Write a protein that binds this DNA or RNA. Structure first.
Ligand SMILES: Nc1ncnc2c1ncn2[C@@H]1O[C@H](COP(=O)(O)OP(=O)(O)O)[C@@H](O)[C@H]1O
Ligand SMILES: [Mn+2]
Length: 451
RNA sequence: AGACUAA
């Protein structure tokens, strides 16, 4: 038994058995991250188990550190700074960090216990990680615990909460607004507002500030200096991307959720390419996670969730299912086994197995294009499997006529390392490297030979 | 688009 949000003395021996995958399917705010996880970790240390803890984002990682503070844990994330002796048997890192380590030339510890928090995360690295973890369990090499309020197959956008939630459907502005949305600024409590992009977040946040509102902007770019500020009394609005979709304990009163996002889609009609489709409705699991940011305080009973529109459950055309398989086909078990996708996430798209297997230098190039080149999984796969080296940027110019990249209606020119002037016309098109002007600048640096 | 950047 336990009290005071403190960990339970009693932990089930069942969850530590090899060949055992435990799905902890508990509602938002039940105590997965900050009460259950510490109990498991303390009991893992006593059992002397080589242990891996996985967070989807740095927001979840920071939440974990608060609960795990004092324990001999090795943090492998910029989100947390702590002294490490080097003899820690418990490692903590993000989902994508682990997949990266699995794809790189050196070698993950042989964990016999793996705890993945937010085991529904649809980021391609997270899906591939679940594939690895579930084969390790199947082989009898590890015990694993998957913690999530929205396990695969979740259709309920309004799950159980610690406190009653007032669900309100209203129109929500995507852009700045002069007028017509007084309900946003008339509210007295603290609001968490989910935006599909940092661009949209910028022009919504400066719109709120000119109304004398204290606004914190959260994303991958501002996390470091800004997340400690949410752990304060000095804010009205948190305008956040999906970095805060999971795990966050903002201690707020309201979530504004437009329930929209841009989705990468692989197009198969004609030459294969990636587009950014949408904005389209988010999944029921995303809506449920976002709503899960509030109604967490049993002493605070009038929290609000303001949303717009229905969710869209069908995401089979989302590129993350192909890309997860592109990664997992190149990940190997120490025994030699390529892992298969976690049960519930199989046949989201037409497999077939080992289709994305890369050889020798191609697998290294594949990883290098993602980690050093900052290119998406699909694009990196296409370049690597064509036998192109990481530093060979020819493919950025040899695309068919229709692949010519435009910026402000003008044909993009690249000046190369050697002073050639060439039109940006890549052989493979991925809208993620050209849609946003900031993304395109980075891709222009890549095409130059300067990345 | 968003997330991750470890050894
Ligand atoms: N720093 C804190 N101070 C007070 N309460 C907290 C703090 N962090 C989390 N909580 C509360 O503890 C409960 C469980 O938190 P958590 O473990 O994050 O739940 P879950 O991971 O299942 O969403 C929630 O009610 C949450 O609001
Ligand atoms: Mn949690």
């Amino acid at each position: 038994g336990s009290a005071m949000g403190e960990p339970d003395y009693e932990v089930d021996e069942d969850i530590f058995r090899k060949k055992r995958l435990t799905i902890m399917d508990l509602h938002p705010g039940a105590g997965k991250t900050k009460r259950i996880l510490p109990s498991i970790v303390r009991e893992a240390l006593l059992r002397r188990l080589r242990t891996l803890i996985l967070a989807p984002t740095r927001v979840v990682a920071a939440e974990m550190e608060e609960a795990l503070r004092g324990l001999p844990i090795r943090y492998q994330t910029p989100a947390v700074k702590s002294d490490h002796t080097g003899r820690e048997i418990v490692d903590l890192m993000c989902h994508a960090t682990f997949t990266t380590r699995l794809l790189s030339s050196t070698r993950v510890p042989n964990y016999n216990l793996i705890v993945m928090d937010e085991a529904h995360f649809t980021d391609p690295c997270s899906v591939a990680a679940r594939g690895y973890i579930s084969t390790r369990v199947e082989m009898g090499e590890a015990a694993a615990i998957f913690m999530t309020a929205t396990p695969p197959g979740s259709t309920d956008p309004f799950p159980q909460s610690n406190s009653p939630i007032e669900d309100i459907e209203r129109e929500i502005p995507e852009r700045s607004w002069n007028t017509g949305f007084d309900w946003i600024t008339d509210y007295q409590g603290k609001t968490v507002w989910f935006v599909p992009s940092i661009k949209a977040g910028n022009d919504i946040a400066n719109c709120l500030r000119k109304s004398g509102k204290r606004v914190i902007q959260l994303s991958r770019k501002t996390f470091d200096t800004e997340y400690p500020k949410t752990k304060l009394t000095d804010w009205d609005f948190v305008v956040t991307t999906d970095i805060s979709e999971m795990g966050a304990n903002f201690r707020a009163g309201r979530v504004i959720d437009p329930r929209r996002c841009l989705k990468p889609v692989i197009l198969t009609d004609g030459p294969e390419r990636v587009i950014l489709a949408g904005p389209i409705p988010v999944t029921p699991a995303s809506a449920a996670q976002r709503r899960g940011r509030i109604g967490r305080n049993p002493a605070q009973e009038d929290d609000q969730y303001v949303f717009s529109g229905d969710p869209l459950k069908n995401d089979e055309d989302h590129a993350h299912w192909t890309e997860a398989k592109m990664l997992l086909d190149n990940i190997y078990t120490p025994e030699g086994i390529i892992p298969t996708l976690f049960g519930p996430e199989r046949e989201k798209t037409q497999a077939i197995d080992g289709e994305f297997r890369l050889r020798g230098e191609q697998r290294k190039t594949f990883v290098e294009l993602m980690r050093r080149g900052d290119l998406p999984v699909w694009l990196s796969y296409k370049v690597a499997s064509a036998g192109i080296s990481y530093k060979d940027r020819e493919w950025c110019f040899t695309g068919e006529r229709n692949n010519q990249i435009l910026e402000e209606n003008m044909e993009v020119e690249i000046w190369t390392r050697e002073g050639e002037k060439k039109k940006l016309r890549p052989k493979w098109l991925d809208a993620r490297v050209y849609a946003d002007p900031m993304a395109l600048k980075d891709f222009k640096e890549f095409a130059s030979g300067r990345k």
